[PDB]
Paper text:
The ordered assembly of [name] protein into amyloid filaments defines a number of neurodegenerative diseases, also known as tauopathies; they are the most common proteinopathies of the human nervous system. The physiological function of [name] is to promote the assembly, and possibly stability, of microtubules. Here, we used cryo-EM to determine the structures of heparin-induced filaments assembled from recombinant full-length 4R [name] (2N4R, 441 amino acid isoform) and the corresponding 3R isoform ([name], 410 amino acid isoform) to resolutions sufficient for de novo atomic modelling. Our results show that heparin-induced 2N4R filaments consist of a mixture of at least four different conformations, whereas heparin-induced [name] filaments mainly adopt a single conformation.
Residue numbers in the entry:
A (entry chain E), B (entry chain D), C (entry chain F): 274, 306 to 330
D (entry chain B), E (entry chain A), F (entry chain C): 272 to 274, 306 to 330
Write the structure that this text describes.
């Protein structure tokens, strides 16, 4: 009996966060 | 009996964080 | 009986953090 | 008995790019 | 008895890039 | 008895790059 259970789990996340705040006056 | 359980778990995360704040006046 | 349990766990994280604050006046 | 022949040679040339540019308040 | 032949030679040329540029308040 | 032949020679030329540049308040 031949059993080839080929189940790859790919949970790799490629994230890119950016925030620009210009001239805060209070 | 041949059992080849090929299950790679890939949880590698490539992150890039940046924040720019210009001229804070209070 | 042949059992080849090929299960690599990849949790390697490549991070890059940066923050720029210009001219703070109070 | 079971004889298994596997020639597993993957060629992965995949490129994942995450480009981001933040621009706030520009004067001229 | 089970005889197994595996020739596992992966060629991984994959390139993951995370470029980020933060720019705030520019005067001219 | 089970005879196993494995020729596991991985060629990993993968390049992971995390470039970041922070720029705040520029005058001219």
């Amino acid at each position: 009996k031949v059993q080839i259970v080929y189940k790859p789990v790919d949970l790799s996340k490629v994230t890119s966060k950016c925030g620009s705040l210009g001239n805060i006056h209070h």
